[PDB]
Amino acid sequence: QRDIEYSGQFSKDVKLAQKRHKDMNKLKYLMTLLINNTLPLPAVYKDHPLQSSWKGYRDAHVEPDWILIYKLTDKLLRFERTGTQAALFG
């Protein structure tokens, strides 16, 4: 059975997104898709694996400059980070 995990940094990220007036319903909706096992995700999310330092994780776009970094295995779904490309990768 697959668990659901929220990293400590992810919780902080959500708070920042809130403070920056982001449309939180868009993120919530994507998280629901992932939790409810939607495969594949709709093309619009540009869902793809990451490499290098982020190998093992995946990346989906909530908006063109708002991404969600998560890990998805048979054993876990872990929400890792969310925010701008620059904040997350720079």
Q: What is the CATH number of the domain that holds 78?
A: 3.30.2310.20
Measured CA to CA, the distance from residue 4 to residue 2 in angstroms comes to: 7
Q: Distances from the Cα of 22 to the Cαs of 15, 44, 50, 55, in angstroms?
A: 10, 18, 24, 27
Q: How big is the chain by its Cα radius of gyration, in Å?
A: 12
Indicate which technique resolved this structure. X-ray
Count of domains in the chain?
Answer: 1
Q: What SS3 state is found at 10?
A: helix
Measured CA to CA, the distance from residue 3 to residue 62 in angstroms comes to: 22
Measured CA to CA, the distance from residue 69 to residue 11 in angstroms comes to: 13
Which residues touch 24 (CB under 8 Å, ≥6 apart)?
A: 14, 17, 18
Give one DSSP letter per residue of 16-78, joined into a string.
Answer: HHHHTT--HHHHHHHHHHHHTT-SSPPGGG--EE--GGGTT-EEEEEETTEEEEEEE-SSEEE
Reported resolution in A? Answer: 1.8
Which secondary structure element, helix H or strand E, spans residue 82, and what is its range?
strand 76-83
Q: What are the phi and psi torsion angles at 20 (to 5°)?
A: -80, 10
Structural domain of residue 51, as residue ranges? 1-90
